[model samples]
Target: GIKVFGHPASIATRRVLIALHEKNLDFELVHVELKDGEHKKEPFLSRNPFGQVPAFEDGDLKLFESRAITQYIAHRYENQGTNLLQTDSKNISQYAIMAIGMQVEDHQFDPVASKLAFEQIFKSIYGLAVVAEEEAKLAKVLDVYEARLKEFKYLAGETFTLTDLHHIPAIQYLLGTPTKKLFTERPRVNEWVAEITKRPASEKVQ
Candidate 1:
């Protein structure tokens, strides 16, 4: 049993309703008044001390703030229905998508991609300027990784996170930019990007 106490057209109310719909959870939408006066009263204050519109009361438990209410419902009833959370080990979308790789994306991978941006992608204004020194430093970084990439297929090791979704943009620039050799020169990195960009899911990238 669930009920949402929020204004009809509020952003917070919409998110709450969306979560309920995504999870296929049956709930009632109980509209409430806003703008300090109607909310800041006795009965309403008992539900939410701050007199908020999105005051969530599910059976016996009561909570204020739409985010908190959403998380509560998701945590409590996930086993009974489709999981609606877009993140965590128990995500609905993650189940729909065919990815299961535990990501170390933040540790080694993102930093390298970021630096590669500064080095290769951010070269100059068509010969008007250049960061030749750091560009060379970035090349050395890739050279070291080229050795590892030779052994393992991807940075986080094979399977692909589909997080490489952004790999398209980088490749678009990589292929378009004059410094594309920063990618082409390194045979290993070049081949890896090529394979991913040409994959079934990645096919749409081109």
Candidate 2:
């Protein structure tokens, strides 16, 4: 069985979990407390030198990076559903979806959600001052998402694919926070997120 090492609250870890669920794969979840520095310990370091959560251990093979892991699992279980990374006539469709998905990760998801987590969530946990600049930055990034969402259901297109899957955890994290009020201001984005969040795999993140 595949073993996943990470905390449930971790966005990266959640991505892997969603992918596993989307592919209907049964895996073991090994919760690693990042606050306690469990990821930095010897056993985990042996599996991932960078000490990142969401590390995958399948027999003798170990993997890190959520996107890579998603691709690995999706390809390994091709018949599970649509080929998220396929080529050919659908290459353009897949690539377009991937491009938009990348933008969501780089601009909307990571900059806003992950940044706020570090500046707000972690800061509160560690008793540090909130970084006002991060809040402003996240707002700007979210504004971009609001605009794009007004134009499309999915980030890339109408049909759901790996592109949509990629941002599930990031959006979920954001929605769980007080910053979620910002999403309500953009009805289109809010609707899109609502649609995706209702997916069976998305519920598994919680």
Candidate 3:
């Protein structure tokens, strides 16, 4: 069986969980309690040098990085079902668009959401640093997303794909939290999020 090491609260872990659920693959969820700094322990560090959540172990194959893990799982299991990772030229083109959409999500959406998470969310919750610069940066990022989402359905196109899956947790983490108001203000962005969040795979997070 496959083994996943991470906390449920982690967005990266949630992404992989969604993929695994989509594939209907059975795996072990080995929770690494980050609050106890378990990721820095010897065996965990050996699996992932970066000391991050979501290090996947299956036999001799040990892999890290949430996106890589999700893609690997998709191809290994769900490729026949949805072909989440494109193989042909037309699908590849779709994949490219999704890739661009992911970039937009990362650069335009994540930065601000991360800032808000770090500032208003994490700071209040964890006593972490809250920088004013982050607020300004997040605001600008939101503006870019507002413009892009007005033009597309899924990040790639009308159809849902792994590309959209890659970003679902981040959007969920942001919109489901106090930062909800910020995202809700951008109607197009909110609608795109809703569309993806409605997918069968997305229900895994709930």
Candidate 4:
């Protein structure tokens, strides 16, 4: 049916995988040899000119960039499963809020979370020393999350949306690090993490 070319280890790849599962869509996970630089090679490069993992193909439609792919799945199959964008045509305000949540993740959460993962996890892998520079940055973001979650059930509002879904992979890695305290120390953020992690889609992404 659908083909997802990437590995589970890549955060961006997992993002697409989680979206597929959340949408209850059936697809094939084509293992790209990311370690061997297979993604930068012929066929893969043709699918994604930038040679990124998780190039997606649904019939003749090909796409790259994990977030864009997830957006497509959310919109195209909105009636099939979870309404990720929470786009209610009747309420422009609701859509505006949801869009804001997405912007927060892209600009605020993602930058810190991914960098923290690199410092804590990947540094040790490549014989480099771990740095705490990103941890404090991430904590600042989590502080905002704590306050926001205290008022709402999810990042976007009452429902689980793409905004929350996008945070899963990076946060999962951070939870395994010492910097996890940033999340655990905030009661609302901790609860929000637990709420999202227990979902079927989140679990499957692992």
Candidate 5:
């Protein structure tokens, strides 16, 4: 069985949970005391040198980085449930496109979205002011997403993939904040988010 060490409150942990659910894989959700800095300690640090909330352990394989873990799950258990990745050699172009989609989420969307989430949602808990620039940047990114989504049913293509899965955590957080309008204003992106979140796998994580 796989052990995911992190708190449910952590977006990264939620990301892994969603992946596991999508693959129909059984996993153990190990609670790591984030507020108490347990992740920064010896045993946890050994599992994840970066001291991140999610440090996965499966048999002898130990891994970190939410995206990396999700990717591993998709391939390792590709036959279990929904195929979240483009591992088929027959569809080279589709695979290439999926790779681009993943990069877009990692490079383009994540940078601004995570920042906006931190500023508008997380920061308020600590009495920090929201940064207008991040909000502006996120709007711009969504504008791109809106355009892209108009062409395909999902970010990677006509089918749902890990690209869309990666955005779930940040989108979930933003929907709770005033930034909810950012997604609602873009019909295509709004529909995309809705479709992704409505899945059975997504339901389990929530």
Candidate 6:
């Protein structure tokens, strides 16, 4: 498990949780009231030089800043789940919608998915086809989930929750985009997406 140094009142804190969700990684979000200057004091200063929230602690590793933390989740868990960094620019506005989420899809597996969408689904369309380097990268991400799907019904397990719902938008986009084969070849992986897409919720977000 990881411990995230952040504040609930801060936007950076929200992004960090979203990323953790996408990666399917568990973490504890440590919050502080900046007005109190607790962050400027000792211990915290050791985590963030600027005394900002969203400082991340993964064992002995420490990091700060929302953009960096967001992409860090994408990079570190790139192979475990959905990738969200876009492998590039975030356009920042992403936080506008990403800021919203369920208790889940938040810390369990949504962060990993965002990048999976960008590199394999979104980026590929924003361009026609994905580059071998990125496509290969996505394939590697899928491999991590392959066994999980075989054992359980979804990424979060036997029960389908927001985690599955979290995947619809990006996946539906991919269906219209150009790389359906990535999922088509894996019936087990594609089946849930196929079935879930038909739901009204998918229609609204898809």
For residue 96, model 3's alpha carbon misses the true position, in angstroms, by: 2.4
In the order shown, the candidates' Cα RMSDs to the true structure are 12.6, 3.1, 3.0, 1.8, 1.9, 14.4
Candidate 2: what lDDT? 0.75
Writing each residue's lDDT as its tens digit, candidate 4 over 73-162 gives 988888877788775734778878887988899899888888888777766667552246677777788888888988899988888888
lDDT of each: 0.57, 0.75, 0.73, 0.86, 0.86, 0.59
Model 4 residue 9 distance off true place after TM-score fit, in angstroms = 1.2
Give residue 111's lDDT in candidate 3 (0 to 100): 59
Ranking by TM-score: 4, 5, 2, 3, 6, 1
Error of 2 at 95 (Å): 1.8
> Per-residue error at 16 for model 1, in Å?
1.3
**Candidate 1 backbone collisions, by pair:** none
Question: Per-residue alpha-carbon lDDT of model 3 for 18-118, expressed as tens digits?
Answer: 88877777789999989889999888999899999999977788999888898788667754555565445256666677677667765666655665664
Off by over 4 Å in 5: 87-90, 122-129
List, residue by residue over 1-206, the lDDT tens digit for candidate 6.
Answer: 59888776453465566567656787787667688888998889888888878688777777887666665676677666555433222445533323332333444334444444456554554652334544465556556556667877766545543345555555665565445676777768688767767764345322
Shift of residue 202 alpha carbon in model 1, Å: 27
lDDT of 2 by residue, 70-180 (tens): 878877876774445543324776676666776667556675567776555554567663446666776786677677777766666556667777877777766756667
* Weakest ten-residue segment in model 6 by summed lDDT: 94-103
Clashing pairs in 2: none
Error of 4 at 67 (Å): 0.9
> For residues 90-145, could you state the per-residue lDDT of candidate 1 as single tens digits?
54655334232113232434344444544544445433223455456547756755
Task: Go through the candidates in order and give the clash count of each.
Answer: 0, 0, 0, 0, 0, 19
Deviation from native of the Cα of residue 36 in model 2, angstroms: 4.0
Q: Mark the 10 consecutive residues where model 2 has the least summed lDDT.
A: 81-90
Q: Is candidate 2 or candidate 4 better by TM-score?
A: 4
Greater lDDT among 2 and 5 belongs to 5
Per-residue lDDT, model 3, residue 105, is 62
Task: State the lDDT at 108 in candidate 1.
Answer: 37
